[PDB]
Amino acid sequence: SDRFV
Amino acid sequence: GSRFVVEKNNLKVTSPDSIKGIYECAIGNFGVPGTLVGTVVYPKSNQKACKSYSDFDISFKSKPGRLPTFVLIDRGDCYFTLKAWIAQQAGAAAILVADSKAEPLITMDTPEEDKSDADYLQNITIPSALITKTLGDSIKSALSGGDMVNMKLDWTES
């Protein structure tokens, strides 16, 4: 569930 | 996989009565400092915080004796870390990033940046949280009607 954008 | 493996924290909307309550949020993986009470603002311009607010002559610094400003920011078009830096530079006391789609909360991660843009990652101090589209829409509706939206942030679980 990790996102940069 | 592991779509629900998110570091969740509770926040409390304390006003208006129509949306008061406890909501889940996801604290960003950066710039964690405690409890802070503030009032939510959704800017009319630069709503994704991808450009400097100084270019718009917009400041979120609170006047003496008033609640610190939590700026509501839309997801999209730039890194979450840049949004938090830009809100920080504009004087916001915290940033709430409203997810652009209705989905489980996500963890705002730190990107791998060019050497020319690596140092600001170390300098982010303001608390940053991702909130659902549903809560973001609820806050925006309250503000557009003229209500004051106050909120208590808790990062003690982080």
Describe this entry's structure for a reader.
The complex is a heterodimer of chains A (5) and B (158). Chain A has 5 residues and is mainly β. Helices cover 0% and strands 40% of the residues of chain A. Chain B has one domain: Glucose Oxidase, domain 1, CATH 3.50.30.30. Chain B contains 2 helices and 8 strands; from the N terminus they run ββββαβββαβ. In chain B, strands 1-2-7-5-4-3-8 form a 7-stranded mixed beta barrel. In chain B, strand 4, helix 1 and strand 5 form a beta-alpha-beta unit. The longest helix of chain B has 12 residues. Chain B: It comes from Arabidopsis thaliana.
Strand order of the largest sheet of chain B: 1-2-7-5-4-3-8
Q: What structural category arises from helix and sheet content of chain A? A: mainly beta
Number of strands of chain B: 8
The helix/strand class of chain B is: alpha/beta
Distance linking N and C termini of chain B: 23 Å
Major protein interface: A-B, 5 and 22 residues
- Please state the overall shape of chain A, judged from the principal axes of the Cα atoms: elongated
Largest sheet of chain A: none
**What is the subunit organization of this protein?**
heterodimer
The coarse overall form of chain B would be: globular
N-to-C span of chain A: 12 Å
Helix amount of chain A: under 10%
| Tally of strands of chain A | 1
Strand content of chain B: 25-35%
CATH topology of chain B: Glucose Oxidase, domain 1
PDB class: protein transport
Keywords: ligand binding domain vacuolar sorting determinant receptor-cargo interaction, protein transport
Assembly: dimeric
Entry title: Arabidopsis thaliana protease-associated domain of vacuolar sorting receptor 1 in complexed with vicilin-like seed storage protein 22 C-terminal pentapeptide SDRFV (pH 5.8)
